[PDB]
């Protein structure tokens, strides 16, 4: 799909790239990592034993209200079955767009934000069940 890319980890590093880019790159058991390549309502359409989904926002320069609402639905619905959705690599501007569209109306959702994919992977290691 052009709207998202499945990422894996290069073994014994903090490097995450396209699962199809290099043979030894492997997904982490219990975690799905998706790089967002188009506004999230496109990726969401494709969506339509995992404890964590990590969404890599490195490529995202801004979000619109429809995108933030979509994202909120994704976080909520995974959350309802105990799966955490983490947001990695959000720029200041993207965080501003999330905030303006009241994504953090519950300040607890601030805990879903991580600077890098690896930070998010490490955040999933031990946590509130």
Curated annotation (Swiss-Prot):
Residues 1-129 are annotated as: Extended region for STAS domain. Induction: Up-regulated in cochlea by thyroid hormone T3, perhaps acting via thyroid hormone receptor (at protein level). It is found in: Lateral cell membrane. It comes from the Eukaryota. Specifically expressed in outer hair cells of cochleae (at protein level). Not detected in other cells of the organ of Corti. The STAS domain mediates dimerization, with both STAS domains latched onto each other in a domain-swapped manner. The N-terminus domain is involved in dimerization such that each N-terminus domain embraces both STAS domains. The STAS domain harbors a unique anion-binding site important for the fine regulation of the high-frequency electromotile properties. The transmembrane domain consists of 14 transmembrane segments organized a 7(+)7 inverted repeat architecture that can be divided into two main helix bundles, the ''core'' domain and the ''gate'' domain. Homodimer. Interacts (via STAS domain) with CALM; this interaction is calcium-dependent and the STAS domain interacts with only one lobe of CALM which is an elongated conformation. Interacts with MYH1. The anion-binding site that controls electromotility and associated charge movement in mammalian corresponds to the central binding site of the anion translocation pathway in non-mammalian. Voltage-sensitive motor protein that drives outer hair cell (OHC) electromotility (eM) and participates in sound amplification in the hearing organ. Converts changes in the transmembrane electric potential into mechanical displacements resulting in the coupling of its expansion to movement of a charged voltage sensor across the lipid membrane. The nature of the voltage sensor is not completely clear, and two models compete. Belongs to the SLC26A/SulP transporter (TC 2.A.53) family. This is Prestin. It comes from Rattus norvegicus.
């Amino acid at each position: 799909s052009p709207s998202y890319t499945v990422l894996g980890q290069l073994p014994d590093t903090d490097v995450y790239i396209d699962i199809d880019a290099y043979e030894e790159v492997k997904e982490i058991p219990g975690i799905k990592i998706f790089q967002i390549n188009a506004p999230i309502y496109y990726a969401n359409s494709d969506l339509y034993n995992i404890h964590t989904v990590i969404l890599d926002f490195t490529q995202v320069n801004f979000m619109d209200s429809v995108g933030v609402k979509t994202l909120a639905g994704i976080v909520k619905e995974y959350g309802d079955v105990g799966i955490y959705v983490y947001l990695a690599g959000c720029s200041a501007q993207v965080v501003n767009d999330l905030t303006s569209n009241r994504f953090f109306e519950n300040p607890a959702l601030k805990e879903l934000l991580f600077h890098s994919i690896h930070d998010a992977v490490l955040g999933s290691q031990v946590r509130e069940a």
